[PDB]
Design a protein around this ligand. Structure first.
Ligand SMILES: [Mg+2]
Ligand SMILES: [Mg+2]
Ligand SMILES: [Mg+2]
Ligand SMILES: [Mg+2]
Ligand SMILES: [Mg+2]
Ligand SMILES: [Mg+2]
Ligand SMILES: [Mg+2]
Ligand SMILES: [Mg+2]
Ligand SMILES: [Mg+2]
Ligand SMILES: [Mg+2]
Ligand SMILES: [Mg+2]
Ligand SMILES: [Mg+2]
Ligand SMILES: [Mg+2]
Ligand SMILES: [Mg+2]
Ligand SMILES: [Mg+2]
Ligand SMILES: [Mg+2]
Ligand SMILES: [Mg+2]
Ligand SMILES: [Mg+2]
Ligand SMILES: [Mg+2]
Ligand SMILES: [Mg+2]
Ligand SMILES: [Mg+2]
Ligand SMILES: [Mg+2]
Ligand SMILES: [Mg+2]
Ligand SMILES: [Mg+2]
Ligand SMILES: [Mg+2]
Ligand SMILES: [Mg+2]
Ligand SMILES: [Mg+2]
Ligand SMILES: [Mg+2]
Ligand SMILES: [Mg+2]
Ligand SMILES: [Mg+2]
Ligand SMILES: [Mg+2]
Ligand SMILES: [Mg+2]
Ligand SMILES: [Mg+2]
Ligand SMILES: [Mg+2]
Ligand SMILES: [Mg+2]
Ligand SMILES: [Mg+2]
Ligand SMILES: [Mg+2]
Ligand SMILES: [Mg+2]
Ligand SMILES: [Mg+2]
Lengths: 54, 122, 119, 211, 117
RNA sequence: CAUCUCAUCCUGGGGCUGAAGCAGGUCCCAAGGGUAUGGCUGUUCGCCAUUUAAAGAGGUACGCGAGCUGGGUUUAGAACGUCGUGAGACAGUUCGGUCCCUAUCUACCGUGGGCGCUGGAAAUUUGAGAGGAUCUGCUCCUAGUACGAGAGGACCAGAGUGGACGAACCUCUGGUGUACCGGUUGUGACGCCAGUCGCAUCGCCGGGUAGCUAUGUUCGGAAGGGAUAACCGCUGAAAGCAUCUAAGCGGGAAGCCUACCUCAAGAUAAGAUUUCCCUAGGACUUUAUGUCCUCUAAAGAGCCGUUCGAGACUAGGACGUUGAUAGGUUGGAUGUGGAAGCAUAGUGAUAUGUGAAGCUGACCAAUACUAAUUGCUCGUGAGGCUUGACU
RNA sequence: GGGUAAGUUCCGACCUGCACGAAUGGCAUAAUGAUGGCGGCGCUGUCUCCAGCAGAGGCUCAGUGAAAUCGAAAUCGCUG
RNA sequence: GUCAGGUCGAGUAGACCAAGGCGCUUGAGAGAACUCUGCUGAAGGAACUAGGCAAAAUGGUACCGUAACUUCGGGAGAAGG
RNA sequence: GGGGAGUGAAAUAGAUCCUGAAACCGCAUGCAUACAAGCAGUGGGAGCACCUUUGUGGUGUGACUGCGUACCUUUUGUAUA
């Protein structure tokens, strides 16, 4: 139910050794020149040579 | 699929009407009996003046079940009730009249009298 | 286990799920471009393309089927006058699902759903 | 024991002249191509390496491309070895082909496949554990494990204890199955009974080890 | 069918090519080969068709009769050589595909209205 | 839910017998596997009924309540017998009476990340080692023979068919199948008739495709090799004989090691085989697998996307336009069982024809219609030294 | 003695009442009781022996964010 | 404490609606073991258990029919159709 | 919320504003650390890094190795579970 001894600050940092974040897949849409998330519509509505909500 | 506490009809005319299974014979921890399997029964209902009386403990052979009987081609045969036939201590049938149909699984040499006296053998 | 099974649950009862997908189909047929979540968008194809396939033949039984399945008279009128004749010579694939980032208050993956030859 | 690699195509029945129905599994064999022969002098043991199927050349690496081009054969979808002897390594050469005619009707075989995966499963399914009372005061303990040990002697759980975990998805061999039909024009084997895995998975057929 | 074309090609090689058409609700007589070792004969099973299954080679149909006061159901496999011959005697007029309710009726209450053309 | 011992209940191997045979008694060797369900009582036990090859004896906090229960005992209520003047009490009996904890560390069952493995990569592997499994009945046959006055009734050897346990699988037989088809009650709506939606446990009722399943279907525990236990020897002295032992040579068990299935090189001793990739320039001094600046970025792996009979998250399998990976579309199959509209017959409920119609999740086959992109990151530039063999 | 194949409980008797007994009442008694014991019919996932499905959690992602405990920890097995 | 409509109904019970009022101040996915709340289940039918605990079952209106025993009221909606 | 500018002797005296300790929590540099079993020190002792001198000097780290079961209380007697 509960610990008998407190955890050292070393064993607490050893558990967090898998807690790191990674980056996303970002590409340059040289149809428009901007940076965008791969396979996603850009911030203003562009994708692979088409524009939504002109 | 007969097991302990199952009630069965009597298909012969030895004097019993309802019998109850109290032991499936032939093996340690054996669960079910099907057509052709010996069974230990107690007599719950009998006819006034016959050789078997209410409360006796006898051997019997199961001849009809609701669960069914598989055949080599993949077919089943079901019946509308469960029935048995009373036997001796020698394991020989003891009646002179069978009632109802019967399957071919009883074409052994110790059960050929039921086949002979049966109205219909499937 | 889930071997070879189709359909979603999406945290709802069966009847709520049916009602929500019917509502989505009606909204799509009206506006022709909507924004939803990606798991809701990918299951909407399986609900909304059969209605367009059905509206390609304009009979009374077909229109009564479309009304039993949409319960919206404006949608039935738009399917058998506009949307059906537009895709009469297209063999399936009348929608388009496009990933569109994440929701602010939720961090939920979103998508655009649009009709193919709109505007 | 030299055998065949095939694909499980489905399960069927065959009626015989005497009316008996025989449950059968169909195995499709695209004829196997010999890609390598390992011998005592360069390997330490005798084996025949075999490929079957087809792969598109954009999914074959340059190393596997060179290995397949060293023989004559085309790239298949998998590669597998069979331990053999000589008098079994008799006429086998690279660029050879093993077909369904390696077997005959009435032969006994073993078929190894990869069984279906059931995921993370409990004690009742994985080890045929018995359940506890359903309604006689039982609180929240129906399909749970029960006891896992003793009391301070030995003071630990023993190794190999039966618990919950992953079930299925292993290599399983079924021995003692009979060949029912060897169709040469469709390149198919039909065997009697059930074989491990799903439809479409890779199976290996080889003569029985018991005999 | 819903099977791979290879299993279907293997199954087609052993279909009975001329079976009489019948539906659930009809009464049929089936002739079944029985063989007690050396001897071979045919036994008749006459009764009402209760169910039917359409799966090519995996077809089957269930027949129900009353023999000596006890009800019997057999589930014949259609394309099995044990079934020598089927003949339809009387056609019935029913409104569903499975007549399992007839299991809990007997006598005048289990009668089937004959289909007349 | 177990785990161990052997002082062994069954099965296996033997010596003696007041051992004719079958069956027993007793002792020795043997721990591989196996080793009932019920009636009564809170019972452990015990008695009884019916089975079985058999229903072993014990240790493990009289194994096991941070795994469950709470019938007995041993709080508070109440009563009987008995004891006490009484408050109360018991070699007693009787009816009723709250079972808390989200798991930190060790252990255990699964599943990943890192680095190592003498340049890097993609596969295919060897097996030091580990785990699993290991049970048994009845019939036939030899043969109604050997043995026995008879009644009875074999060893050795072979053939079949069961029980219990386990695995895999879904063709068959069934269950389930709240995104499939139909019948029907109440009420509200869609303007109304007709039609058909919401809600009432999926309202209720009858069916049922895939998948998953057991009660369904197949298969397994076969045969062999080696060293042994008790026991039986051959030859043979010490001890002219005798003697299985001292020298020498043998037979011998469900036990041991192999043999069958599965895992396995983090086996840090980190093994092997096939194939693939990398061959530019300048300075420079802490002078050595030394550093710095331009040039370069391979084989491959991953991110991402479409997804899966793979899955908690992972990992693993397939595909990404030179494409059938998923959805849709078209054909088929299946289930349900005679759609809507119209026409006819009938006073009407309704029935018939058009027409086995209409609809039909997850199935099979085709088909680029929709989505799998223009990409980015990582991974380098020939791989120290010393010896010995071949050149 | 009865009931069950089998009944330490139940019902009927016997009287050998360890230690019943007549208003701290004795022996019965129709009706009534969420009262104690025992036996039947029906019905059943209580069970043999569990399978499938539905919703809420569990699990993953985003936001907020406790608890009891705690000498310090570089916190393995067996035999003593 | 007061008011309290419609269809069916004996009803202020109950299902669905009116007028009126709300979707209850974390969501999105996935669809493992196990836990909770449900639904269906072959053949058997209390073998479960201290104990049929829990579930399953019965259920309306009219008419026919109803035992011992009794304090003469009952029992009795006995039972059963 | 901060960065410049400006005030002031002083702004890590800027309003949570004199001084500003410890427990606790970061970022940077050096060395050690992924085949090895336990009160974490102590006695030895190689290597590396930085200062310095021409060191038998200084500072940090510590491969490998002998020995080694916390403190208080109460007790005949405590690593004591
Ligand atoms: Mg730190
Ligand atoms: Mg799928
Ligand atoms: Mg949710
Ligand atoms: Mg509903
Ligand atoms: Mg899976
Ligand atoms: Mg509780
Ligand atoms: Mg519960
Ligand atoms: Mg210990
Ligand atoms: Mg011994
Ligand atoms: Mg007992
Ligand atoms: Mg009883
Ligand atoms: Mg104990
Ligand atoms: Mg108690
Ligand atoms: Mg008291
Ligand atoms: Mg099936
Ligand atoms: Mg099914
Ligand atoms: Mg109407
Ligand atoms: Mg409502
Ligand atoms: Mg289609
Ligand atoms: Mg309809
Ligand atoms: Mg009892
Ligand atoms: Mg008294
Ligand atoms: Mg008195
Ligand atoms: Mg009262
Ligand atoms: Mg969170
Ligand atoms: Mg049932
Ligand atoms: Mg049933
Ligand atoms: Mg009982
Ligand atoms: Mg019991
Ligand atoms: Mg109850
Ligand atoms: Mg209920
Ligand atoms: Mg300062
Ligand atoms: Mg200050
Ligand atoms: Mg090291
Ligand atoms: Mg340690
Ligand atoms: Mg003390
Ligand atoms: Mg003391
Ligand atoms: Mg000491
Ligand atoms: Mg301790």
């Amino acid at each position: 139910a509960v610990q008998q001894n407190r955890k050292s600050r070393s064993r607490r940092d050893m558990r967090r050794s898998h807690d790191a974040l990674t980056e996303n897949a970002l590409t340059v849409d040289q149809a428009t020149g901007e940076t965008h998330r791969r396979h996603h519509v850009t911030k203003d509505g562009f994708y692979r040579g088409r524009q939504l909500f002109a | 699929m007969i097991q302990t506490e199952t009630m069965l009809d009597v298909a012969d005319n030895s004097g019993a009407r309802r019998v109850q299974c109290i032991k499936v014979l032939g093996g340690s921890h054996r669960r079910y009996a099907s057509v052709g399997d010996i069974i230990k029964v107690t007599v719950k209902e009998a006819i006034p003046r016959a050789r078997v009386k209410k409360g006796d403990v006898m051997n019997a052979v199961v001849v009809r079940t609701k669960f069914g009987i598989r055949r080599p081609d993949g077919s089943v045969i079901r019946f509308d009730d469960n029935a048995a036939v009373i036997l001796n201590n020698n394991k020989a049938p003891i009646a002179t009249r069978i009632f109802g149909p019967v399957t071919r699984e009883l074409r052994t040499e110790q059960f050929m009298k039921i086949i002979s006296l049966a109205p219909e053998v499937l | 286990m889930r071997h070879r099974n189709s359909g979603v649950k999406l945290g709802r009862t069966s009847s709520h799920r049916k009602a929500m997908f019917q509502n989505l189909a009606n909204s799509l047929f009206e506006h022709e471009l909507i924004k939803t979540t990606l798991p809701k968008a990918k299951e909407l194809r399986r609900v909304a393309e059969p209605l367009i396939t059905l509206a390609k033949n304009d009979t009374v039984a077909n229109r009564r089927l479309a009304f039993a399945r949409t319960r919206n008279a404006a949608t039935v009128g738009k399917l058998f006058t506009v949307l059906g004749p537009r895709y009469k010579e297209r063999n399936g694939g009348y929608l388009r699902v496009l990933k569109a980032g994440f929701r602010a208050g939720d961090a939920a993956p979103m998508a655009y759903v649009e009709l193919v030859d709109r505007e | 024991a030299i055998g065949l690699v095939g694909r499980k195509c489905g399960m069927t029945r065959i009626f015989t002249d005497a009316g008996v129905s025989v449950p059968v599994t169909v195995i499709e064999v695209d004829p196997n191509r010999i890609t390598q022969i390992k011998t005592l002098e360069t390997d330490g043991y005798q084996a025949v390496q075999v490929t079957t199927g087809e792969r598109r050349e954009s999914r074959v690496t340059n190393a596997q491309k060179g290995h397949f081009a060293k023989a004559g054969v085309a790239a298949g979808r998998l590669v597998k070895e069979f331990r053999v002897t000589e008098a079994e390594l008799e006429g086998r050469e690279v660029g050879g082909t093993i077909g369904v005619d390696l077997f005959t009707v009435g032969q006994i075989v073993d078929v190894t496949g990869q069984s279906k995966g059931k995921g993370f499963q409990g004690g009742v399914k994985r080890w045929n554990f018995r359940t506890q009372d359903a309604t006689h005061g039982n609180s929240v303990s129906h399909r749970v494990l029960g006891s896992t040990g003793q009391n301070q002697t030995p003071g630990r759980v023993f190794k190999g204890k039966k618990m919950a975990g992953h079930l299925g998805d292993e290599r399983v061999t079924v021995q003692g199955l009979e060949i029912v039909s060897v169709d040469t024009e469709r390149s198919v084997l039909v065997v009697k009974g059930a074989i491990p895995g799903a439809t479409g998975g890779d199976v290996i057929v080889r003569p029985t080890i018991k005999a | 069918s819903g099977k791979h074309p290879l299993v279907q090609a293997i199954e087609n090689s052993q279909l009975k090519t001329d079976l009489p058409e019948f539906a659930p609700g009809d009464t049929v007589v089936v002739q079944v080969k029985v063989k007690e070792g050396d001897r071979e004969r045919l036994q008749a099973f006459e009764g009402v068709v209760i169910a039917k299954k359409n799966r090519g080679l995996n077809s089957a149909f269930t027949v129900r009769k009353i023999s000596s006061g006890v009800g019997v159901e057999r589930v014949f496999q259609t394309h099995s050589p044990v079934v020598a011959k089927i003949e339809v005697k009387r056609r019935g007029d029913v409104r569903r595909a499975k007549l399992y309710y007839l299991r809990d009726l007997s006598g005048k209450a289990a009668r089937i209205r004959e289909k007349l053309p």
